[PDB]
Design an enzyme around this catalytic site. Structure first.
Site, short mmCIF file in Angstrom:
data_model
loop_
_atom_site.label_atom_id
_atom_site.label_comp_id
_atom_site.label_asym_id
_atom_site.label_seq_id
_atom_site.Cartn_x
_atom_site.Cartn_y
_atom_site.Cartn_z
N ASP A 89 0.81 -1.21 0.00
CA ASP A 89 0.00 0.00 0.00
C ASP A 89 0.85 1.28 0.00
OD1 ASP A 89 -1.81 1.96 0.33
OD2 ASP A 89 -2.78 1.04 2.10
N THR A 90 1.08 1.81 -1.22
CA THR A 90 1.89 3.04 -1.33
C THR A 90 1.24 4.24 -0.69
OG1 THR A 90 0.99 3.52 -3.52
CG2 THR A 90 2.99 2.17 -3.43
N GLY A 91 -0.06 4.23 -0.45
CA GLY A 91 -0.73 5.34 0.21
C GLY A 91 -0.68 5.33 1.71
C1 LIG Z 1 0.21 6.29 9.32
O1 LIG Z 1 0.05 5.12 8.55
C2 LIG Z 1 -1.17 4.94 7.99
C3 LIG Z 1 -2.20 5.88 8.03
C4 LIG Z 1 -3.34 5.66 7.27
C5 LIG Z 1 -3.51 4.49 6.56
S1 LIG Z 1 -4.94 4.30 5.55
O2 LIG Z 1 -5.18 2.84 5.54
O3 LIG Z 1 -5.96 5.17 6.07
N1 LIG Z 1 -4.59 4.76 4.04
C6 LIG Z 1 -4.15 6.14 3.89
C7 LIG Z 1 -4.73 6.83 2.63
C8 LIG Z 1 -6.26 6.88 2.71
C9 LIG Z 1 -4.17 8.27 2.60
C10 LIG Z 1 -4.03 3.80 3.10
C11 LIG Z 1 -4.96 3.36 1.99
O4 LIG Z 1 -4.26 2.70 0.95
C12 LIG Z 1 -6.16 2.56 2.40
C13 LIG Z 1 -5.84 1.14 2.85
C14 LIG Z 1 -7.13 0.46 3.35
C15 LIG Z 1 -7.74 -0.53 2.57
C16 LIG Z 1 -8.90 -1.11 3.02
C17 LIG Z 1 -9.43 -0.73 4.23
C18 LIG Z 1 -8.81 0.20 5.07
C19 LIG Z 1 -7.67 0.79 4.60
N2 LIG Z 1 -7.13 2.49 1.33
C20 LIG Z 1 -8.34 3.07 1.30
O5 LIG Z 1 -8.84 3.73 2.24
O6 LIG Z 1 -8.96 2.86 0.12
C21 LIG Z 1 -10.34 3.34 0.01
C22 LIG Z 1 -10.47 3.92 -1.39
O7 LIG Z 1 -10.69 2.80 -2.24
C23 LIG Z 1 -11.19 1.72 -1.53
O8 LIG Z 1 -10.30 0.64 -1.56
C24 LIG Z 1 -10.01 0.14 -0.28
O9 LIG Z 1 -10.38 -1.24 -0.22
C25 LIG Z 1 -11.80 -1.12 -0.07
C26 LIG Z 1 -11.98 -0.08 1.03
C27 LIG Z 1 -10.85 0.92 0.72
C28 LIG Z 1 -11.30 2.13 -0.08
C29 LIG Z 1 -2.52 3.50 6.59
C30 LIG Z 1 -1.37 3.72 7.33
CL LIG Z 2 2.14 7.36 1.36
#
Ligand SMILES: COc1ccc(S(=O)(=O)N(CC(C)C)C[C@@H](O)[C@H](Cc2ccccc2)NC(=O)O[C@H]2CO[C@H]3O[C@@H]4OCC[C@@H]4[C@H]32)cc1
Ligand SMILES: [Cl-]
Ligand SMILES: [Cl-]
Ligand SMILES: [Cl-]
Ligand SMILES: [Cl-]
Ligand SMILES: [Cl-]
Ligand code: NA
Lengths: 99, 99
Positions: free
Chosen positions: B25-27
């Site tokens: 997860d690059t985000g």
């Molecule tokens: C300080 O370190 C951190 C702080 C925050 C996070 S995070 O999980 O909130 N996130 C930060 C980002 C929103 C700026 C990482 C993301 O990659 C998350 C990672 C994530 C995935 C699933 C569930 C929770 C988090 N993805 C996410 O929220 O995706 C949303 C948008 O698309 C959908 O796909 C995903 O899959 C379906 C639901 C989500 C929906 C991780 C580590």
């Molecule tokens: Cl990031």
């Protein structure tokens, strides 16, 4: 380009004529942008995340440039803390993870 | 490997002697794993994303094996809806985003 991950992978996007900063986010299925005006009709979507759920507005077939690469596809709009480029558009610009 | 983004980029990890599936997860700044015990000291943390914040336990100096590649770093443990390998460990396995 080859983008390392020591810092957040932020790029400039252009959407609705406007430049914005966004994250290129392999953990995001979809693309989510801060409140803004987009053309056409929207459909409801609830998305999940860390924290819980968020309602968004789903706009389809939106023209968006990402780091100079042209994409046309779905953009979710809502009160996200960060603009996120998800896999639906990362695939359109040909992005892969490599190690 | 080269991992395309048509589907979620899930890999097998080994952490705390346990095998888990996790998202590259690059985000994500941080690595966040579903509830499990880890050895050593921890301290509380709040992390934020699409739906607000979640409280986690922060464990430092934790070894992980990510798709065969060992790394060490901080791991956050909490009720994450998905296990996530964030940039703090992606850097250590040499992962880049390419397009
Ligand atoms: C300080 O370190 C951190 C702080 C925050 C996070 S995070 O999980 O909130 N996130 C930060 C980002 C929103 C700026 C990482 C993301 O990659 C998350 C990672 C994530 C995935 C699933 C569930 C929770 C988090 N993805 C996410 O929220 O995706 C949303 C948008 O698309 C959908 O796909 C995903 O899959 C379906 C639901 C989500 C929906 C991780 C580590
Ligand atoms: Cl990031
Ligand atoms: Cl994903
Ligand atoms: Cl799309
Ligand atoms: Cl770390
Ligand atoms: Cl490097
Ligand atoms: Na420790």
């Amino acid at each position: 380009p080859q983008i390392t991950l020591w810092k957040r992978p932020l790029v400039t996007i252009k959407i609705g004529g406007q430049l914005k900063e966004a994250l290129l986010d392999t953990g995001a299925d979809d693309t989510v942008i801060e409140e803004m005006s987009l053309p056409g009709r929207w459909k409801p979507k609830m998305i999940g995340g860390i924290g819980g759920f968020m309602k968004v507005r789903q706009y389809d077939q939106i023209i968006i440039e990402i780091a100079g690469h042209k994409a046309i596809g779905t953009v979710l709009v809502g009160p996200t803390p960060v603009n996120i480029i998800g896999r639906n558009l990362l695939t359109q610009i040909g992005a892969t993870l490599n190690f």
